[PDB]
Amino acid sequence: VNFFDELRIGLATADDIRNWSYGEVKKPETINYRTLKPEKDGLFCEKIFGPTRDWECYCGKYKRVRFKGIICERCGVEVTRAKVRRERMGHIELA
Amino acid sequence: LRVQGPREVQIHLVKEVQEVYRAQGVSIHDKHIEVIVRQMLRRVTIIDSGSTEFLPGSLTERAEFEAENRRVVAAGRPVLMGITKASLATDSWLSAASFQETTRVLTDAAINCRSDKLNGLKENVIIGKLIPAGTGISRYRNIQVQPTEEARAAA
Amino acid sequence: GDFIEDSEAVVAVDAVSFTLLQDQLQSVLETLSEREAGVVRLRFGLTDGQPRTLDEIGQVYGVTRERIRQIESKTMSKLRHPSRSQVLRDYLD
Amino acid sequence: NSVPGAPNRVSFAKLREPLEVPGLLDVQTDSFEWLVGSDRWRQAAIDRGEENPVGGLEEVLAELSPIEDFSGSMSLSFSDPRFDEVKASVDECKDKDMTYAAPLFVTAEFINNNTGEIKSQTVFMGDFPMMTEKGTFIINGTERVVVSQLVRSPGVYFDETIDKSTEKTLHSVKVIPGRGAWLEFVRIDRKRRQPVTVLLKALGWTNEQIVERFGFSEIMMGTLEKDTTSGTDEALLDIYRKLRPGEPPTKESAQTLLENLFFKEKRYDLARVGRYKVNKKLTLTEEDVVATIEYLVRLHEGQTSMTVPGGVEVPVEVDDIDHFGNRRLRTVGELIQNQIRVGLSRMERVVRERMTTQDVEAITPQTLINIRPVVAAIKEFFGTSQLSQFMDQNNPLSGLTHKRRLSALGPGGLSRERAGLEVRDVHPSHYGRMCPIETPEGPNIGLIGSLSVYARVNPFGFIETPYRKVENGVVTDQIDYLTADEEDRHVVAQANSPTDENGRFTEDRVMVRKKGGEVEFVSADQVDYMDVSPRQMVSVATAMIPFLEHDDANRALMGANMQRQAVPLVRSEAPLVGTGMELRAAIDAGDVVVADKTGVIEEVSADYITVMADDGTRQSYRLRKFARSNHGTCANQRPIVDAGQRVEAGQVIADGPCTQNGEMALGKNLLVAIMPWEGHNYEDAIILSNRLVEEDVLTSIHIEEHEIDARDTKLGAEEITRDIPNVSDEVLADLDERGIVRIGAEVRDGDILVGKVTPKGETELTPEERLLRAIFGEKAREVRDTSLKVPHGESGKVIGIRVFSREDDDELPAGVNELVRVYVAQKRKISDGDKLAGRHGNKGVIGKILPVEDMPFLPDGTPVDIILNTHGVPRRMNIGQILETHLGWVAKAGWNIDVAAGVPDWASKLPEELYSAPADSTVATPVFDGAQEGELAGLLGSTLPNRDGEVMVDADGKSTLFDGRSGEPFPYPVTVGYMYILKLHHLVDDKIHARSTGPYSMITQQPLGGKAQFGGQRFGEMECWAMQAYGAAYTLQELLTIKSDDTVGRVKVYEAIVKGENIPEPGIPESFKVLLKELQSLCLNVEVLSSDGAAIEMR
Amino acid sequence: KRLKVVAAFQQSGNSPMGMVLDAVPVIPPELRPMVQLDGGRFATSDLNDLYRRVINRNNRLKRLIDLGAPEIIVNNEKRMLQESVDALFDNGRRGRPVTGPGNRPLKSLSDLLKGKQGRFRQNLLGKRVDYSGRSVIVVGPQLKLHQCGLPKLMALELFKPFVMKRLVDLNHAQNIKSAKRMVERQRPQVWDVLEEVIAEHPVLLNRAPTLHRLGIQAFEPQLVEGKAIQLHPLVCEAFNADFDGDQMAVHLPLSAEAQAEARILMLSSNNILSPASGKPLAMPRLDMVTGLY
Amino acid sequence: VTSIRIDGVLHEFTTVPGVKEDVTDIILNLKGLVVSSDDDEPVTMYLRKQGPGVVTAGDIVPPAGVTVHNPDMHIATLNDKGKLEVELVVERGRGYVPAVQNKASGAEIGRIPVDSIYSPVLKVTYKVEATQRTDFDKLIIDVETKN
Amino acid sequence: VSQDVIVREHDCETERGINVTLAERGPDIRDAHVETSAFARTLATDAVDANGNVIIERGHDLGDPAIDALLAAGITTVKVRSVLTCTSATGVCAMCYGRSMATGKLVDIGEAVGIVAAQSIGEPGTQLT
DNA sequence: GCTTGACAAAAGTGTTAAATTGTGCTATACT
Ligand SMILES: [Mg+2]
Ligand SMILES: [Zn+2]
Ligand SMILES: [Zn+2]
């Protein structure tokens, strides 16, 4: 839009933080040491944060722009632009 | 300030500042100095509320203090403050954050649940808006141009 | 960290030339029979982006896969014909 | 002079050097030879000084031996370090990217006190980097220098600071050790609220002893009178909770705390420097901690003499941390020693613990020893350390001053930001030790300095300066090297004081320096020592400025800095008007080839020079040829000798990059005209004769190194190849079989050097791309094209190629199969925009170069090469540049006396044998005795001809120039002459950058700066201020959105310019979107609200 | 003072509970990237090791809770969990900072925003820009006050998309791809074209540091031989420009508004007097004084 | 003289076995060549020398229609192993033309382009003397050439 | 601190101002600096000699001629418009700010005079010893 | 201008062996 009026701050509640989150990252894992692919449930996990490649799920069963906005029933990755990997947040649920 | 009053401090500060620069051979028209000095006198300390909505010892803008203080049917004193402390008092919270003491600013802003109207020009720079000065002012940017019917005729 | 290029960043000159290439093809295809152009588009998935098998294109025009394979060879030698191909050469890469 | 092949350069010096300049690379070689303790250092310390020399390596090995656990049941002992012959030669290491190193060996003895058995084992510590003849190291193939650091010597230093409130006097003493906690008066370990009396009882001394020892000290009694601590053990408890808060103590822990902190040798490190400092001034002894407090009380009282209760008398006075007596200077050997000590202590930890869990009697010196931390200390010291730097070489002089540099920064010293200007100021004790005139102009001023010419480093780390002792108004030949402490002891006579016959004081009174240092005038009666010569205070580069004494220290500093900034020219002409140092600075640099034995030349080739000694031995020297230097200058060498030539030991066989016939040539001698010329040379700009282009007088070469490797990828192996997926056969036209550019080829910006390819997939080609493939039948290739091309804005000829292949045995890090390096070189003609300068700090860009036809030209028709503006000269106090401009003309045209009948009055003081020099003879005016104003005028008239007997310059150093443009003369006489001007390493080709579109940053989409990245310019905070003051909103918005951060807008704007459409409206800067995300991650809820509808989503 | 905080929570709807975290957000991966450099060796943000300590300790805490554990052990975990989330948000703000190899403290989330290298000053109030260049400057004595010497190589790259269009308009090149190669290889046809696009198309010249707005001024570009920049001798005063080897940046205004602002507001000849004292700046100096004197 | 070709060397920055001067310091020397040619069109000269000695411009064998006017000039000094085989191309023109790179010309990797100075004249000056009232002007010009 | 101060309107119309000294006590002699104080301003009220004739009307630019004219009439002070006394609701007003040092005329309504003031003050700071 | 059958490559699909990965455990005494 490029024209907004106000810009506001406040304390983020745990619920606000949970609503932002596209998933809870449960593992302190970055990427596999062999395949160098993002490890599931870790930081960088494609299930939560997003696809590494445009309209390409982790396993690849749905590789095409034909169906955007569907989730792969196998790897649970959403088919959309890898740009979301820049926009999407996770959360940690503390014990 | 307390002795001779708000308008006299200005005269003093301009003279003093203008003396240092005169010593070194520099020519600055007093108005430039006045623009800066004007920003140190813009607030007043709130001694009593009394029904406000304001808090004692707080520094509030003179205009904002006068209008809401009316409240149809709350006393303060002129306040001198340095340029650094003054700029931190600015209503723009992301303007203050970018200036200095970023963590202090963000924490107080999130507690006060502060809303920034994005009026100032530094705010508009950060977000990529058109600064509200020069050619960015409404009266200029909304100019509408058409050739005179007399001109279109000549083609 | 700030010396790292972004390798997936869009390059403006290519996206524009790709837009221009997408224009020249639309034109060159117009020099082909309605069915000739229609078969090439479906075969390579120009419009949809999803390529199609010879049997699938035969299903839309009501022919055998072999017929489509034939029509494919002809329009390709027509496309390879220099008057059509001369303009697309500089798009090699 | 005194150098066998020295060229003939006449000197105006009226004095005689009593002492040759010492070898000025010595500071590096001595420090290292001490560390390794080779016999060369053995003889040195045996023939004088102490009788038990301990090498640095052995010295740190004594500290380790033995290793004993708490049980003392086993002891691991070290001894006898040994080095093998160097692995590979320096030349081999620089080529193969290895480090020049000798393997080190040690004898490790492990003893079991229970079984009384001994196990002796030879141990390999690691490859220990060695030092080249030139004082450098080769670390992973790159030549590096270890700069010596300035530090505060261990000792007790007192400071008197007036009270910020009461204004009353206070001290305020400090004790700084080698290692361990430091104390201040007892404020300890940064714990305030500590009376100095409470600890004096903590040792067990009863109060009467305080009343006995304190004595005349009133506050000594009042502090114990005010202190409420009763008993020696109770005071240890008030010390225990302040030092170790949180831990309930024990009588075993309360007592050992103080004993272990300082007295114990392990925790508190006595320094040989600290041990020597205070031992004379007054591990740590209880005797020493009492004398501390005693010295203090007898300071604040005002007495100048303290006789210890049982000790010897010394002055009681404040100490100065900036006085060089208290300031070292840890040299390279020591900087290595300390890093070794750290490596061993980290190993001792694994040696101690290893003993416990290792099955006993199965432990050997090896099983307990793991050398990982020892070599890591060395490797991690040379890399990543600020004292270990890539040698600075664009010219021999730059390299020679890099060594000899001393800086106060680095680990073990103050940070650049914190230290105040008191350390940056020159101290009176810097005289003859650290050159005051040479430091950086940046905010390193005074923190970095160069060691003086005759300065010499002490085995303890204090700089010494040579002096000649005077006795009874007679200066002896005795030359004694004194430190700063012993210099404050005596009266240093001025270097030039009139000499009498066989020598003695002539002038009634003597110039002298006191211990202030405060200058004074006393007769010849009271002197002790005299200066060895002028320019003791000066450094090498400073000593190279002709007429230094005429230039303000400001422009002199700039002048020194810029000499080390010059670049070697192809021709390398030596300075027409020089100083002393040019000869000896070039040979000691090492970039010139010197013969080490008298003999004769057997062969002279461009490749090498062999000499047949009178000794019957045969020495040969391989010549560096077009070797690329660290920063890209050219190291090329040329032989100055012929086959038959006789030669003597120490002579100069071949010239280096910046040398001619043995002396440093950093520039060319040019014909200068000081008139302002048609607004072209203005505001420091310079104009040049196109001759300097045509004749390649300012030309210099340059060489760039390009590198690419072929590694193993998860998807395959990278392959260097000539096959590139999409190219015309034209681009490949210069590639050989393997796909690397052919030697002698010409390469433009974007040309291919090494073709390379890497696997790719799965590709998923675009439909529009797959259709063209079918039409033109080019199979989409299996692999992406990642290939080495020449950077934007560069060009030259391909010089050489270096290939390292895994197929060939070679060697390489895991994963790298093939490595190819390509060396490109180019001749750079002097170009408009290049930066030139003289030795006086006068600098400027070339603003124009004119056809030799139209230039100011002398009556001969001789065009001037440079026109320098008159206005920059007078106000800058550099007028020395005008002198050498006159002398330059003298030295070029020759001259005569002045006789007969007699010698004129001015020559009487006096030029000796200087009465006549032919045309083109070279001159030398040592800095602080040079030519003198009177002697210039007398020479200024002399001598014709051009060829015809007419004279081209008057006694004012002026001439009538004819404008080569209109042909008419210039109305007034103009100063002409010859000036020595250097070409400097700021060049237009390197500094010209331009960008339209290019790479963008990963996290922020901004363009990434620097020429390597093809980067854009930074529009900064201050630039936006200027933009706002103008009131240009659309310009400002543009720069900050569609010209940097706007990912859709920047590609649209491009689309618009190429279609000639209107430029579209800007979008949101990506960086701002990032900011919101970073604030969210702090649990700050940041919503962008419209007028409404409330929250907007960035997406 | 204590009222200022307590009062702030009343008027706003903020629950003060927010100051204690049940859940910690995790920043998107591309803002804390992990990527392999040229050669395959990997580099990543410090944030990931910081997030790793937190999640490691939270998971250990779950484990100890389920087994049952003496408070000494469990409380120790919670204390560790607390410190790790501190280091993540603000590192070193309490106690010694979490360090990596070489003992250099890891960069926290707060380290992103703060300082001269933080987002605001580094990436927000300023930034690097397209369509810009720089070189060393040389005297312009023959220039008109509104003009500047522009190195033709520099001009070519700056205007590249403009000429690419022009030489496609004229038939020099048949398609945009050919136009791009024609400019890169610098085939001689482009020069005549460059003069066309550059005509009456202004450019901004800046020299750092920029003290007053006069530190940026628009000029009329003139194609010049050589790699240096020709600067009119009367603007040195405003730029404080020494020819000792100073460099200056060139910026190309694009949009119609930007070009208008250049010609009208920032043009060299319209800014003469200093906007402080009103005294003249472009007035002659140095050589020009003594020449007229 | 425009370009030069030396058998052994493919470029300017190497040495030659036994020769005392590197190829670049030899190109500098060849700069001082003062030649003259009837032209037109390019013509190659030739130089070959073996065994010890000193090479000079006299050792250059010019083709028919060209001449070398300072054979006394030193080129390179050779030793027992030194051999120098180099051909030189003389073109015709005026002024100073910087070396034309063989990427711009049609030359192959072997050719070494060199800066060319075509300037017969060496140093030139003048002066005038009037012809008192009725004064006229008579100028003398001093012209020197390279031979 | 000053970046948000821009000229928002032509006139706030206030009669308030500040008194400039404009020399004194002679001859029996311009103030050393009337160039940075009195010049470029705009008169708040009419400048009147005894008894007197109103030599310059309120709102005058006060150029060089105006100071000479005034000085003749023997006026040893003048009340001047300043941004200190300006009553504008937002920003300041052109009349109160006075002449633009750059243009030499009344400031334009877009001008951001805070930034210009900030820079005019800080730039010479390098010369302040 | 189009279709049929024989046919081989290509592409999936299920079935199995090999490898990779995760977890438990080690009892002189050692705090
Ligand atoms: Mg400068
Ligand atoms: Zn999937
Ligand atoms: Zn107003």
Residue numbers in the entry:
A (entry chain D): 4 to 98
B (entry chain D): 1123 to 1195, 1202 to 1283
C (entry chain F): 374 to 466
D (entry chain C): 21 to 205, 215 to 311, 323 to 1139
E (entry chain D): 294 to 586
F (entry chain A): 51 to 181, 185 to 200
G (entry chain D): 879 to 906, 910 to 1010
The authors write:
Rifamycins, an important component of modern TB therapy, target the Mtb RNA polymerase (RNAP), the enzyme responsible for all transcription in the bacterium. In bacteria, transcription initiation occurs when the ∼400 kDa RNAP catalytic core enzyme (E, subunit composition α2ββ′ω) associates with the promoter specificity subunit, σA, to create the holoenzyme (EσA), which directs the enzyme to promoter DNA sites through sequence-specific recognition of the −35 and −10 promoter elements by σA domains 4 (σA4) and 2 (σA2), respectively. Initial EσA/promoter DNA recognition triggers a series of events as the enzyme unwinds 12–14 bp of DNA to form the transcriptionally competent open promoter complex (RPo)34. Recent mechanistic studies have revealed that mycobacteria RNAP exhibits unexpected differences in basic and regulated functions from those of Eco and Thermus.
Previously we described a 2.76 Å-resolution crystal structure of M. smegmatis (Msm) EσA with RbpA and bound to an upstream fork (us-fork) promoter DNA fragment (RbpA/EσA/us-fork), focusing on the roles of the essential transcription factors RbpA and CarD in the initiation process. During refinement of the Msm RbpA/EσA/us-fork complex, unaccounted difference density appeared that corresponded to an αCTD bound to an A/T-rich region of the promoter DNA from −29 to −24 (A−29AAGTG−24). The αCTD structure was built and refined previously but was not addressed in the earlier manuscript. The location of the Msm αCTD and its relationship to neighbouring molecules in the crystal packing environment indicates that the αCTD belongs to a symmetry-related RNAP and is bound to the DNA adventitiously (αCTDsymm) in a non-physiologically relevant position of the promoter between the −10 and −35 elements rather than the physiologically relevant position upstream of the −35 element. The structure of the Msm αCTD is essentially identical to the Eco αCTD (r.m.s.d. of 0.586 Å over 40 Cα’s). All of the αCTD DNA-interacting residues are conserved between Msm, Mtb and Eco, and the αCTD/DNA interactions are essentially identical, including an ordered water molecule that mediates interactions between Msm/Eco R259/R265, N288/N294 and the DNA. The striking similarities between Eco and Msm αCTD structure and DNA interactions raises the possibility that αCTD/UP-element interactions play a role in mycobacteria transcription regulation. The Msm TIC structures show that β′i1 spans roughly residues 140–230 and folds into two long anti-parallel α-helices (β′i1-α1, residues 141–186; β′i1-α2, residues 191–228). The Msm TIC structures contain full-length σA, and clear electron density for an α-helix extending from the N-terminus of σA1.2 was observed.
